[PDB]
Design a protein around this motif. Sequence first.
Motif, short mmCIF file in Angstrom:
data_model
loop_
_atom_site.label_atom_id
_atom_site.label_comp_id
_atom_site.label_asym_id
_atom_site.label_seq_id
_atom_site.Cartn_x
_atom_site.Cartn_y
_atom_site.Cartn_z
N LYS A 1 26.39 6.61 26.11
CA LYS A 1 27.82 6.81 26.32
C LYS A 1 28.47 5.60 26.97
O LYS A 1 29.55 5.18 26.56
CB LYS A 1 28.05 8.07 27.16
N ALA A 2 27.82 5.01 27.98
CA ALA A 2 28.35 3.83 28.64
C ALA A 2 28.36 2.62 27.71
O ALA A 2 29.32 1.84 27.71
CB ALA A 2 27.55 3.53 29.90
N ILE A 3 27.31 2.43 26.91
CA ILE A 3 27.28 1.31 25.97
C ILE A 3 28.41 1.44 24.95
O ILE A 3 29.13 0.48 24.67
CB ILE A 3 25.91 1.21 25.28
N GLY B 1 31.22 3.23 25.24
CA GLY B 1 32.50 3.11 25.91
C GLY B 1 32.82 1.71 26.38
O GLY B 1 33.99 1.39 26.57
N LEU B 2 31.80 0.88 26.57
CA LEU B 2 32.04 -0.53 26.87
C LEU B 2 32.33 -1.32 25.60
O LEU B 2 33.22 -2.17 25.59
CB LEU B 2 30.85 -1.13 27.61
N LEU B 3 31.59 -1.05 24.52
CA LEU B 3 31.81 -1.79 23.28
C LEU B 3 33.17 -1.48 22.68
O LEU B 3 33.93 -2.40 22.33
CB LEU B 3 30.70 -1.47 22.28
#
Lengths: 332, 344, 332, 332, 333, 320
Positions: free
Chosen positions: E29-31, E33-35
């Motif tokens: 989810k963090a990857i 949401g960062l991309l």
Amino acid sequence: HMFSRFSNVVSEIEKKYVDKISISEIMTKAIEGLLSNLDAHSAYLNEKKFKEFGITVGMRDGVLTVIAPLEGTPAYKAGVKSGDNILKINNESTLSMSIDDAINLMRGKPKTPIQITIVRKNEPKPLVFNIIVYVKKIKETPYLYVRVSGFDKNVTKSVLEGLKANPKAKGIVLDLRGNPGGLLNQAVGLSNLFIKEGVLVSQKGKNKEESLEYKANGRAPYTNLPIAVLVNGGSASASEIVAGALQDHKRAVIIGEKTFGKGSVQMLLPVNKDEAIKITTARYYLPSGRTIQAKGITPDIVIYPKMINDDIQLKTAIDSLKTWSIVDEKMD
Amino acid sequence: HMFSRFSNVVSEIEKKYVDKISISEIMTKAIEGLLSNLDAHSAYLNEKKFKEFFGGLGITVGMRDGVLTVIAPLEGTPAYKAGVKSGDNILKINNESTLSMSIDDAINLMRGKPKTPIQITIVRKNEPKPLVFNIIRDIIKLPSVYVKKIKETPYLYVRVSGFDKNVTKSVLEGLKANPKAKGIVLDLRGNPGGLLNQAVGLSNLFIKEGVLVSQKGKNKEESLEYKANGRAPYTNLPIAVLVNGGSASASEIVAGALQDHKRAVIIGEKTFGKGSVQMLLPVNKDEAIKITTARYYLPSGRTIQAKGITPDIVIYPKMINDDIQLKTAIDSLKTWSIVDEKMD
Amino acid sequence: HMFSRFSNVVSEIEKKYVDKISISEIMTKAIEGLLSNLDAHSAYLNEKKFKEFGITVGMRDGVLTVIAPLEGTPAYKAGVKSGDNILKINNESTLSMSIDDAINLMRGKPKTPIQITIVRKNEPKPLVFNIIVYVKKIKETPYLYVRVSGFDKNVTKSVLEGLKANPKAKGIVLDLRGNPGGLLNQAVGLSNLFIKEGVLVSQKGKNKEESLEYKANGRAPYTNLPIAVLVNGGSASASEIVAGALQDHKRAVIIGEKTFGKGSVQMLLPVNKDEAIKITTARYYLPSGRTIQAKGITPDIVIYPKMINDDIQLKTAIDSLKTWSIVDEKMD
Amino acid sequence: HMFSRFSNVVSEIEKKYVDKISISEIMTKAIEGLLSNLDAHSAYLNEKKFKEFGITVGMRDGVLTVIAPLEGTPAYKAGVKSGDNILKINNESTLSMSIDDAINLMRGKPKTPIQITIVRKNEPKPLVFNIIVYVKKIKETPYLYVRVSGFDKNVTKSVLEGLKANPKAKGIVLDLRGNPGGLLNQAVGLSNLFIKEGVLVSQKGKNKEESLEYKANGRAPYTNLPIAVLVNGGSASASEIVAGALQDHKRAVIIGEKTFGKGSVQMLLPVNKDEAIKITTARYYLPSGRTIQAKGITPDIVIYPKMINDDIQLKTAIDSLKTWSIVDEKMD
Amino acid sequence: HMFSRFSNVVSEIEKKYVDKISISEIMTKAIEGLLSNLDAHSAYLNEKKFKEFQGITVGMRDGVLTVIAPLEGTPAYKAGVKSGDNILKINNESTLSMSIDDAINLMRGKPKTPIQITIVRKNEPKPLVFNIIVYVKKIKETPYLYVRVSGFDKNVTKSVLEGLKANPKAKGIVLDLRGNPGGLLNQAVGLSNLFIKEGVLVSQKGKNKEESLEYKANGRAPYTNLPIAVLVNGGSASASEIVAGALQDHKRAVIIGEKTFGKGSVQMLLPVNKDEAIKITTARYYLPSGRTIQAKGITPDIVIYPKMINDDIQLKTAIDSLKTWSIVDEKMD
Amino acid sequence: HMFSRFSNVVSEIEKKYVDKISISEIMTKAIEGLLSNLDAHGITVGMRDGVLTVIAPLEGTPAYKAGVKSGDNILKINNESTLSMSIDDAINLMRGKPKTPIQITIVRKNEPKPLVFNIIVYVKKIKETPYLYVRVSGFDKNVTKSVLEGLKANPKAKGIVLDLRGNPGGLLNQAVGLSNLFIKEGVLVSQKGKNKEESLEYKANGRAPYTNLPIAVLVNGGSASASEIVAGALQDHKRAVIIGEKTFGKGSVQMLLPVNKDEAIKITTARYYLPSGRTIQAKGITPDIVIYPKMINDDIQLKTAIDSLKTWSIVDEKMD
């Protein structure tokens, strides 16, 4: 001497009138005139037609109209509706003739086009037409549906069987709209299924004799079963008998347009071989102590215009029956 | 007496009726029923014209197809503000049901103290709902009689809308003022009748021989008849006479002396067949009644009341081009003048 | 010496003009520059055509317009009516030329293709169209309706036998619109049936010689037969020279709108070796003392411009003729 | 060795991107992305913003929508209605930001002119606008209609005394339209009036410890008093508690449009030694068992729009209230 | 190097959050949401079909998905969808929070599949829902030839050698680029028309000086004097303004149409697992004038808003400019 | 005398005609009938669709504010039938003391009825662009110097939008002088007749200062033959871009022969020739591209002209 007006009038009109008239012609033209000017409806029956005795027709405020047509007649297929003010039939003015003439000119030999002209309120010109009990279980709704187009015989058992189909239902819809009415006894017997205590109706006149009354019994299986009744302007007599038996006992909520108050008892009694008369003998009085005739019965809720969604008033009745089911489930 | 065949019914109706009503009331109801089957313009009542004899709104009411009807609005009266027109059936007056009464009752209710507003509900042919008219009363009265000359032609057009005050002399002097006209348009529109004597005098001008109007009943005695003398000054004068629904009674003996004797040309619309006379007379010691005893006829032998005067040319609507009826009448008048010139 | 101005102009024009011109083509452009310049109806004709010898065009105030088409050709079906100002035909401008050029352009073989453009007042755009004698009774009335197809030869006998076939002596309505006209002898023969005394018309000019005049004979069997003339703006020449005799003799009343004048006579005369000239030499003068040119007949009746009810003007004429019958019946 | 993928990704982003990016910016973007893909109500607050800290804004189908204003605020002058999606504020794109940012933009000094462009369904193009607790007796019937606009203290005793003032009402119409509600305690107190037993509302998470439960005790004086509450999209959160207490316990009639399922509670907590995030650790629960979130209170009767006849919602609610009053009258 | 700030978040929200999550879930989810948030054109391929087995282009107009240009062959053009329309839903799933790759993968499928898409067009208050299921033409009565390009790579360089060497009758050619999404700069064989005179036609720049490709042109294009007028509109993007920069910077044409917006960007693939990878926009195209396509595009000199030639006003003005160029050439010659 | 073929007509018309008319009137009619078959020949009037038609009112006269436009045919003047006259008659009717109240009825294409009306060089710099747009009011004398100085004031413009609309034209010498600016060699005009002698011809010299200056000239029906000299020079020597509607080609010039103190006749002894073998009469200079209708977007003519001028400037810059 008070026994002098009629003799003088008859003598003058049989002597000096622009045409010649005898005793028979003045007598026959005075009896029927008194009949018509005495009450709402009256009729003298001739001896020849006394051996045996289309749309339903009923006067309102003196102008002859059709109260509630039926689908079985060709006139409904022609385009006749409730509230239609009849003006002329077969090149003959209708401001003065009895219903009997209407039923002879309407019912008889088929394949006979009859040039009926009717004045409707919604549009100016008079239209001209060349004219020639039921219990259901509605789909997508467990609640039962009731449609009555008349209070005929052998209906109480049919209604009981129809209501036996879905006892679990917490509400029914009563379709008394467009109903000319029916027998008082049939109406009170049908309404007996929804009330248990008190008087269903009281038929009272000015003489204490023959003040027929109908009482409730313990044969009602649907006292607490919720009901909502649909009425409109075009319901009459027995319709308001049921809608007074229910609404007066506070065992229903009456939803629809304000109805038309009519209904009284009349019969034929031969006073002579060549003399026959008809007159309003007595009236129907609802259990509240008020008569149908004066103003009708006002519904608590008034609103004017698969299949349930096509009628706003039926939607309001559905609202009311659902609320009654809600109260029943809250208490239970 | 032979009351029995109705006394049986009076006893039955005073024995088994919903209410308990007096014998006088049921007697009155039977009398009204006899009236409502003999005819359509009779009224029987106790109170009558014993001490009756003012003003009014100039309205006129007549019985057609069972409904009273306003026929002739008048410019002198304040009816201009109300905008009342012909062909309006009477439904309610003073916001109460007036479905079925007699003409005399409407006349009495109209008559009264002036400067009093009145509410009239009437159904017009093209309107969807019975309109409510607020009409105020007045006292100003003015007959409408005048003589005018038609433009760019010697012919004259004069207007006479009533049969009052014996206007025959005024009509005679107006006609004699310009005898050069070989044709004059006479209008019976906006004149549902009047005094029969004035009508006889007016129709006496155009007819020199023969009978004019004959009032007869079923009794030969008093078969009153009017005959025109040789005093007719305009026995040769051609005319064109326009009639419509706004004419009855007195304005229908003229259009029977002319059309049936070919003396004039009749154009317009079918008229109103009010060709009978109503008179008051007593029936009892303290009661007076109003029922007709004789009608009147036309020189051809037909009667006015039965069907009404029929125009020869039928047509329905700078004044000449305003209405097609006056245009057709002027065409007929010009053709008659041309035939007169061709004969000359 | 005003003729010397012609020498000066012809020299200054045949010497220094921007095109090569000679005596022949300066004389030919002055012959046709004076003919069709005096009056719009004059023209020049060549002797090459002299040995040889659908719509109608009349010069309304110079600009060529169409008077009345013919049903025998699809020209009438093309929608051309009166007042149609011709502007172009066969993709060539109808600026200024004689009617003979137009009749060469369109009239001829029925298979000849024609294209005409007209600038009518009703439609602002120039519309373009491509084009390739009885007596009848009137229903319900004693009168009969009579129409003439054309003023050609042997038409008087037909109308006479038609009028003699039915002895209707109360009145007849006569139709004249749609007839362009024709020869004078046919017109006088047709109109002598109605006219009995006096002069029906007089042909007159500046020359006292050949002032031909036609006089009515006492052999007219329809002097008192009522008639109402039915004319409009589409009537000219032979439909107003004899039809004006009626109103001149007070023998009728004309019904319609103001008509048109085409009552001048012309013929061909040689002017040189192989040249011909057409010029209106004389005129028709009505018995009232006035000529048709160019006002027609002044209006009599102001009117808006099974079979009878379809046209208002015929209804007004019927009203007038009924009035005449009424006068006749009163006198009789 | 499962602690290498994210380090590799952040190193790659910091190495071969268009612009040189600090560790602070890349980590902030990663945390913001986690917040956005994790929960729809998140915020990122720093140490400076932590000490520092009208119209309604809510997320529907991704877009930010304004639900309903408050008549106390000058928004009534601006004519702010429902069914509006904020397309721009002060002419800046509003595609994707946190709700807290929009709330902070709205909050400020009163009477501040702020430009706001909104998208309305009826209008074809977005428009730009500027922004600069009583008891009523229903007419003709002893029923009452009450309104609550201020969600402050002593409102429970005020509504209790208002109800006690006129106990003749055999049923009272209610509505939650245009009321998002505030704290849950006052909502529980208000809904306690119509519920005398059982659970009223609860606030739980996946952590069993610290799960609040509010149950109404036996002090409700109107458990038998009929109600018909009207709900629409203009109500969410702390008003849906009442419509979940009544609808699911059968103590009122719920009619109208579907509400907004804003059933969760938001609070601020610190994530790091200097950073803090605003996340929802708790949500509401209905006494039936399900949650308000994402679906909202579902009305039983669904319809869409003297004062009763103006709007169909109040008409239908009055119908249901009258039917319930009739059932109560029938019972006694 | 250090996860500290993010590791506090992961350790907290693994337990303190409302719902139960695992380390892998929050990591992915963090990857993602960062991309997706770092740049509008960057996303991670979790389990796409390219890992296992190996219809229009959607462009983010200011962050919102919009239709760029439908294809005539596909029923997308038959659906009537026009450019500038904000896509809001596809197959009963909201489009507000995914990458273009998901949309294009969902669009591609078995034939005869009626994939439903809801797009909010500006001209209509309500969003319509549609269930979606190079050549040279001799224009009538005109010696000019109409060139319609369906892919940008088709217009680089082949025609001088073989294409236009057999038909010298082309003294004027209509050059249309409207609705062209873009293409490569070096891969085409068929009918590759060319008009660029010489010099630098496009350049690339960024942070890495390596692989900063800058394609150049030499004097191998004898068509430097052939008159052209270029038709562009909002539907042109990326390389479609590379050419409209090359020409308008060489003054080799006048640009006629409506002001457009491009999407010139370069993304590459970096493995993060066995087969799949992630993408990020790292370099962009730069025009020879010294500018770049992003942002605000390149303004046509002539801006006019919208028997084939007589049916469109803009082409009627481009043909006017072409005729004027022919007039200039005739005057000088 | 040798006019027998006219003496015969005059005798027939003085003998067998309806009326009797004086010989002088017949002779005047004969002169007028001859003057009306060889040739078709404030406010402007010209021959279209067989009648006199107004073209464009002058800005200074009240006809400018009277609402007089194109596409109007002359039907009546002073409420009289005016179906067919010579142009000179209407010219003399209008000409005289200015500010003369006079009622004119004109047929209007976009009206149901013909209405009645009671009639009683600047250089602009186009904003944001180096190009400038100019206009010409009249073709009278001493105009070339003003145009030359206006052009020389700002020679930076690589393109000028020439406005020929609203300028009816004038003498040939002024047209040649004003069109000499854009042509440096070759023939400009040729006024010739069937006679070789007196074939005046004008040729441009090397004085032209704007031989390479691109220009777009707009011409429509509002530009008459007297101004089409520039559009016959430029459009045929490829020195500008001609856009608009077809012009009014009344090319030929007549000369006056007086017959009295105030009466005279006119015959077209002179014709025009373009420097391509063409002539203005009567087709006129056909525009290259045809169109039909913050000062540019209001109309399509100037929009397309500016487009062609900008393309011209782009080709010029590409050459540089």
